[PDB]
From a paper:
[name] is a membrane‐bound lipoprotein of [name] endowed with both a peptidyl‐prolyl isomerase and a foldase activity, and plays a key role in assisting the folding of many secreted enterococcal proteins. It is located at the membrane–wall interface, therefore easily accessible to inhibitors and to the immune system and an ideal target for drug and vaccine development.
Our data point to a functional cross‐talk between the foldase and peptidyl‐prolyl isomerase activities of [name], through the protein‐swapping involved in dimerisation. Also, our work provides key structural data for the design of antimicrobials and cross‐protective vaccine antigens against nosocomial infections.
Author numbering:
A (entry chain B): 30 to 300
B (entry chain A): 29 to 303
Write the structure that this text describes.
């Protein structure tokens, strides 16, 4: 009840509500809170604790030893950042449940798909460093040796910079996939400038092609994964998700009891 | 707690809303302001009257049209509730004012760029030719008042013969205008004057006739009441100032945050060790 007190006067949760319920930020909030609840009641069974754990783990290693404490900063606990993860997973489950892929959808996926290749990567923090490296590889230093000695991708460095990837591989920069796929077997890239998911990560890279793969004609060979890429595409359209969310709110018979949020769903329940 | 909404298996209560909202940064700031408002209201509230609330409401209302009434429903406010906001800011500023102790220096600064009240006439034109034409007219003769009535696009002043009274502090008059105006001797007509603003960006032109200029002289004591005013208004907008004052009043009110989720909400005002 009491959020704070002072000489003559108390501020309650109720007093806080009456103010907050006006704020735009809280319009958006109660919207999301309704959406999450509806999708959780419907698609929540499709999401497992294992997958929540998995997603937590993923993002945690991808965000430092400080993550634990970066959540204190964002007001979250562990168990409550999971709750957010569990909300997003059931949400996307729901969207996925409304995907019906078309021969067009597939064709679009295809047009820019590349199948899995084996390659070796050296990553450097400098431009000279990578320029210097490419000359080395030109001379004929063993790739794996240069990789072992130099690559700053500690992920791959001990293995001779061996990576496997396709057009969809997320951990690998776009400028890299771009250059790599061009290469014939045993051919070494030029230097490659890029940006990473960081927001400023201006890395450089050299690449050796181990096993390139041509995709051919009959797209049916890669139909299982084309279905996938295609599905991921739709899940990012707002025309799509708007519609889907629209449908599910209708399905769940959502009734706004507080006049203050009477308008909160209007973005969906409309023509 | 009340239900905010319901659906097939599931209710969202105010309580459920709270536990989520109390994390949001927006709501950090909110409970901050709400604590500050309450503290100043308990202390300086008597210094604010319903009349002054009404006054402030009225002011802003006429300054927005038939829009306003309905622009508040848009911002989630009622009339009764927008008043409560006005009453919160008035008691806030009351409190700040209560901590102003002006210095000889404060006054001196006010003085340095003060000009006392002058009587003048202003014609506003939306063209450059129009105003160039006008200045020749005033040069010829014809009553200033007449030219003002016929031409000035400032419907504010147009019916009065363009009579304005103002000083250095008058906000409704463009600074490039006050600049040119104060230079003028009595009965002297300005040159054309280009300027800005109005609707946050524009290019108006102005002609000015000086009716009664006033020199400020030496003894700054003559204008002590209004220098104190300018000075007071200056302090009320210093952050170092207001921070300190708000700091003090929270201390005075022995504010205790009962929900760990806002434990940090007053920290901007809790001055501590700095070496």
């Amino acid at each position: 009840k009491d959020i704070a007190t002072m000489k003559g006067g108390t501020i309650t949760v109720s007093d806080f509500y009456d103010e907050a319920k006006l704020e735009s930020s809280n319009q958006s909030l109660v919207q999301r809170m309704i959406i999450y609840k509806v999708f959780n009641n419907k698609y929540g069974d499709k999401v497992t604790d294992k997958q929540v754990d998995a997603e937590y783990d993923k993002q945690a290693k991808s965000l430092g030893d400080t993550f634990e404490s970066q959540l204190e900063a964002a007001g979250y606990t562990k168990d409550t950042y999971k709750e957010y993860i569990r909300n997003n997973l059931a949400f996307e489950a729901g969207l996925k449940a409304h995907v019906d892929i078309t021969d067009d959808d597939l064709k679009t996926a295809w047009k820019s798909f590349h199948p899995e290749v084996e390659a070796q990567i050296i990553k450097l923090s400098s431009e000279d460093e990578a320029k210097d490296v490419k000359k080395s590889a030109d001379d004929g230093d063993d790739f794996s040796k240069l990789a072992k000695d130099k690559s700053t991708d500690t992920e791959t460095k001990e293995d001779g910079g061996k990576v496997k990837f396709d057009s969809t591989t997320t951990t690998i920069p776009a400028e890299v996939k771009e250059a790599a796929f061009k290469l014939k077997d045993g051919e070494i890239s030029d230097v490659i400038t890029t940006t990473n998911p960081t927001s400023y990560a201006t890395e450089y890279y050299v690449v050796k092609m181990v096993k390139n793969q041509n995709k051919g004609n009959d797209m049916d060979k890669y139909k299982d994964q084309l279905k996938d890429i295609a599905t991921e595409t739709k899940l990012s359209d707002n025309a799509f998700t708007t519609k889907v969310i629209g449908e599910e709110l209708k399905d769940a018979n959502v009734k706004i009891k507080d006049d203050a949020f009477e308008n909160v769903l209007s973005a969906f329940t409309t023509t």
